[PDB]
Amino acid sequence: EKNVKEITDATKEPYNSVVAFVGGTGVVVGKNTIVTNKHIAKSNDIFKNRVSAHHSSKGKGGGNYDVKDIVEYPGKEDLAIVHVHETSTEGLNFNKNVSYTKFADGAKVKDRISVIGYPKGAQTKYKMFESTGTINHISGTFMEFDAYAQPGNSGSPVLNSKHELIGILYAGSGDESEKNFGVYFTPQLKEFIQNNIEK
Numbered sequence: 001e002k003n004v005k006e007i008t009d010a011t012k013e014p015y016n017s018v019v020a021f022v023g024g025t026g027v028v029v030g031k032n033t034i035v036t037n038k039h040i041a042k043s044n045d046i047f048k049n050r051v052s053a054h055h056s057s058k059g060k061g062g063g064n065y066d067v068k069d070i071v072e073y074p075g076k077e078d079l080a081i082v083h084v085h086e087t088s089t090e091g092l093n094f095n096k097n098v099s100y101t102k103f104a105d106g107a108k109v110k111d112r113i114s115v116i117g118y119p120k121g122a123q124t125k126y127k128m129f130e131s132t133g134t135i136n137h138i139s140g141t142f143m144e145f146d147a148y149a150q151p152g153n154s155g156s157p158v159l160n161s162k163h164e165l166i167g168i169l170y171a172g173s174g175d176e177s178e179k180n181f182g183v184y185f186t187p188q189l190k191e192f193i194q195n196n197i198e199k
C-alpha cells in the first residue's frame with residue numbers, strides 16, 4: 001500500500017507516544033521508556049542527540065530529552081529500550097508530554113496496520129507521517145507488512161486498529177519500500193520490554 005498522511009498535530013494519542021531520534025523513530029511504552037531498533041539506539045549513541053517527544057509541524061512542542069541509558073535485546077532482533085532523563089532543559093516533564101502505548105498481544109495476517117514515524121526526517125524538518133498497510137506474514141518474532149516506508153522509519157511503531165502496539169519496523173526491501181519487516185512482539189519480547197520499564 002502507498003497511503004501516507006502527515007500528522008500535523010501529534011499532541012493526541014497515539015501520536016503523542018511517538019518519538020523522533022536524529023535518524024529514526026521510537027515509541028513510548030512506560031515511565032521514561034522508549035522502544036526502538038537496536039541500530040537506531042546505537043547510531044544515536046555516536047552523536048548523543050536528545051530525543052524529541054512527538055515532534056510535528058504544528059501543535060505544542062513536547063520537549064527534547066537527554067538519553068539516560070540503553071538496554072539492547074540480547075538476541076538477534078533489532079530491538080532496544082532507550083531510557084530518557086525525565087526533565088528537559090526547559091523544565092518539561094517527559095511523562096506529562098507523552099502517552100504510554102499498550103500492547104496488542106499479537107496480530108493476524110491480513111490485519112490492517114499503521115506505521116507512524118519520521119520518513120526522511122532530516123529533509124522534512126521531522127514531520128510525522130502515518131502510513132497504512134496490511135500484515136502479510138508472521139513467524140516467531142518476525143513480521144512482514146506492506147505499508148510504505150522510507151529511511152527514518154526504522155523503529156516506527158506498527159499499530160493495530162485500536163492503536164495498540166504489535167511491534168516495530170526495523171528493515172525493508174529497498175533504501176525506500178512497500179515490503180517491510182518488523183520485529184513482532186511475542187510474549188517473550190513483551191516480557192523483556194515490560195521488565196525494562198522504569199518503576
Ligand SMILES: [Cl-]
Pocket residue numbers: 091092093094096097
Ligand atoms: Cl511539563
